[PDB]
Assembly symmetry: D2
Amino acid sequence: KLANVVILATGGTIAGAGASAANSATYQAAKLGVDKLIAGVPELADIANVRGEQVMQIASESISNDDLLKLGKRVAELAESKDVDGIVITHGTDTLEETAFFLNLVEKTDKPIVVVGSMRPGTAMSADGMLNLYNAVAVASDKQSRGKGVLVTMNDEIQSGRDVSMAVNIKTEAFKSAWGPMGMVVEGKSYWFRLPAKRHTVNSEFDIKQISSLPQVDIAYGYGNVTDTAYKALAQNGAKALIHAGTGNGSVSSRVVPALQELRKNGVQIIRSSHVNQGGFVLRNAEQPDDKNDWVVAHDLNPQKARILAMVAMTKTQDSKELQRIFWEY
Amino acid sequence: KLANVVILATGGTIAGAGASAANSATYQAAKLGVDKLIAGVPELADIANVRGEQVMQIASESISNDDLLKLGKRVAELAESKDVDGIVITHGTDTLEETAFFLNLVEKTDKPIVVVGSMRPGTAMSADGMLNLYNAVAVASDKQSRGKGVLVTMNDEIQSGRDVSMAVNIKTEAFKSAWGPMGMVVEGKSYWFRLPAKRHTVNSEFDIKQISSLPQVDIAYGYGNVTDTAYKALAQNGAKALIHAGTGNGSVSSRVVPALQELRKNGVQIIRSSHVNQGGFVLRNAEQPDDKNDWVVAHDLNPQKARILAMVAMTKTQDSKELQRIFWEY
Amino acid sequence: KLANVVILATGGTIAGAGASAANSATYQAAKLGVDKLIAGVPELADIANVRGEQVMQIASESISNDDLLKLGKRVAELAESKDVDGIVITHGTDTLEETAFFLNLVEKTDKPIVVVGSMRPGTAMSADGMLNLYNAVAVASDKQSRGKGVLVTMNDEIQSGRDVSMAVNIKTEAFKSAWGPMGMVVEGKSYWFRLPAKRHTVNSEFDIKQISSLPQVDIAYGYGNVTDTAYKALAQNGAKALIHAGTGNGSVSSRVVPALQELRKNGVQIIRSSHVNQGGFVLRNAEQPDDKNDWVVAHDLNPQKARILAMVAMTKTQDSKELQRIFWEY
Amino acid sequence: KLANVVILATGGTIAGAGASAANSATYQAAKLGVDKLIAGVPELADIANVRGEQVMQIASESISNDDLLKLGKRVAELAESKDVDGIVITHGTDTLEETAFFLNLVEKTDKPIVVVGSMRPGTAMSADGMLNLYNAVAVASDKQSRGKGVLVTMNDEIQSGRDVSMAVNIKTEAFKSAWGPMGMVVEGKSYWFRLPAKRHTVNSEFDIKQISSLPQVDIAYGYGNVTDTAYKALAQNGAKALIHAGTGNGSVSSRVVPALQELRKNGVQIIRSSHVNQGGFVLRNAEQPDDKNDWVVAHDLNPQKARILAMVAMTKTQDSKELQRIFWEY
């Protein structure tokens, strides 16, 4: 009668603890195991048959590519199981948007996958995690969630895992998309207003089942008087692609362009993103001659999202034209 | 009767040119001289006595610290002149927010200083620069602008140069502040709704007249699987402070903390900012033990803004407690 | 081969004129005919084969139901023509959102229909109307626009005609949706990030071909110390439904509930909307017992949008359960 | 020694109760007395000496002018007491913005006055009221709050009572200002980023001590095919001023202008506001000839705020030029 939902716990503020009820912002992440999360929301038994597993127990700022692969592979094993209807991942906020996008690209399933965190620990007055987790389970149990790609369910919203980002610090409305929420979840019911347009999950060319390793990708920032130092150092320490987090429309300083040309000739993919992250996108051939240089633009994707897509894409191709297509379809 | 306004041109898209009227996003910056910009808005003569000077002719993504000092010293000379009532600076968008904040810290004048750019070049259909420049001159000529600190006048808004940032790519509403616009400018008239709270201009402890060369400060990004490589390389190549553009509330990967402790022990200031830029702020001692490590938080300041404040602050102090006070006052 | 686009002119600021180039906000609407509007953007020939018709010449604040029917019927005649690929409607901003939603409900066509205005008259410095009209023709000429419902193309955005609203005065970013833009249009190219979820155009149960008149529907506002006066007066002067623009979640004053029960028994449909228009929705049975009173909630639709849906819906049904279904599907 | 704060309870969702923990949106307001609210936040004793009074027990959508006066007069008595350092008012969300603006105009004190509500009842999972009430008391007890005018402390923000509005339904981020938050409150500490520019409290020309009964003011909505019916009926039933909630920049249908000219000639003040409430303002003489007609524009104020200012203003003046000055200063 009720859906079978599995909760995969990774740590985070949602599993965190502070010293008193007034500690909404100063806490230790990743203190409570998945069984204590489930025990703290007894109302979950009203909306689904829930089982929990601990995949990891980390502050998400310290996540690694090996962690992503472990989580992605477990999600795929559960998605293939006839006994599983939906999956919830409890996660720290800091890199929640990276995990959600990674799963959106590599999980070839129409089964709902929801990633959820909290801005306050469960010890705090007015802690947000209990209702976030209830909503995540509600959404993971809802037929309307099938085929919608990875979702994030914080602040009573249904956000696309593709382009939701941690945009506001401290407040519970932290996660926003340039392209809006797709829906809302209220008193366990989902209300949809938009659908995804971009390739995901079942329509993805990528599959975690065929990924055993991820290429190293790093990010360097653009600002006044920036030099080529970080770009060269990152490449010298193994980066196979650099995400340029440029000013404006992925613009590159005249002090940095020559190093990026030299790195591209040395086989490093050069992907122009920006730190202009509330809306718009980076236009090919506008601020830099990407065709002449054989560079790629990240479209609307912020730097950390562009890193995820580049890493997944480079499991399959190092062709800059193919990478640009991928950045325009996902 | 009319105010005496000087326009200091530095380049940018507002001085740009594209190949066709439909080229609103693909153009070359810094092509038109200040006399051509002034001649493109003959209505300036109705609202002020305007004179133009060409300080530099750059795409603002390529600005240097020596460019900031040249511009800041020319602004100081003009502010000291009885014959100047207000100052407008035409600037590229990419680092407009950095220049505006710098001038807000180092110009000890109550004379209006307005920084303005455009998202479309003057060759485009529906180019925004003409009305942006008219509005900048209107605000620079208005007695209500005196003592308000440095202002930015795009999109019919009066924004604080402190915390306005380039937040949306392509669109004319690019410049936004987490704390809102302070006012609007419409048909030459200024309408105020908020005042600055933070220290600026006449109440600043800093003065451009004292600064000969700015200290080197660099920025490193935080993301999944980040290593200490960029942080160490930037310090090796001369960084006196490192702005950490962390995930979430300025969080630091467990892979990076030991390097930042070693760098602080070797005299490099460690300032925790974030790429969570739509609202909120980074809280001292929350994600990291700043007191134990002698680190600084950047409060609400985005990484490029924190870099500007760290450079100015270190012309006066190397005491981390004084740097934290400055990050809480400015 | 270029698309054949018809421009249907109705008036508005985009056809407006002010006394001087500095008049961005003080002007007269509906002065320029469609042939002069088209002649002002000769670049339209690069993206489509365009012809103009003058349907009407009004300030949109003064639109009537007879004007909607005239425009809707003309759109339908063009959409049935094999010689028409797309339709652009130039329109005043004030009720643009009402016309766009009306057409989204009643035009049973997959051919693109775009509604466009401007915040500044074409006489103004940095007038927005030329690029808005270029973008409207670009989107109306694009195969990606087929089957997406009615679209609004201002501020470089592709907004859904369903739920875009005039949200910001004066500024060119005036039109916003709670559910985000669906895409952007830049240098003639359309970039999509979301799809509509709600029923529209070809999947609508409503058809302008079967509508010869519209039921009278009026709107009354909720606030502190509101009385039942406006509600009763509007019904006495022919309203067949009343849109309640409530405080909060469509809340109704205890001073107004009895009048609404008497009006419902008298056969007036009662639809709870709100003046809380930036996000969320009005929940059935939450603030008022809608099932007991036989009332309807407007879901996320603002009062003027709810009026349009009620008026179209009541051409087909006066069954309150059917109207609630319609408010949940469109 | 702790500040003495008095909590004045008026009802609302913050005092509400739902049937179960999953009832975040469906509940009964105004169920719990002030002593139970205070008992539900035992941490209040750490930050202030609190006492509670029950002023009334209502759902705020049903507030009256006499309720405003009863609360305003009690606030005045407490502000005049040496034993009171700060005042918190617990309130329903629906008309919280109206009460906060009223108090901002009529309380001639620099003592902190905070108005607070919740979007979820205290019975819900992740109820927001506990931390909102803690934050209200923290802000009411803070020296930084003195002289700032009336404040609203929801969602970790410090918002101006002047121009904060209920803008988002259901979500805890409901309260927003076009001009941004002025600050934040985190772990009991206040962080300021802007100051008010408009007249309030100690600099107000109005005083609650002089007002015995407020004049009747009503609101009529503008939309396609609107008629003069609601305007005339509201005036016939005693409105001394009509707030016109127009489309766009307070625009008036050509079907309505004649009635509004006649009402003005008969002594009814005509104030043009709008239902365009996310930003911008209504410009005098732009959409209508206000000077010719002796009408007033509401500036940036939404209709329900404009009604509050019009009521207070008309306790002093019937001169439309003085009313316009008031609408430009407050």
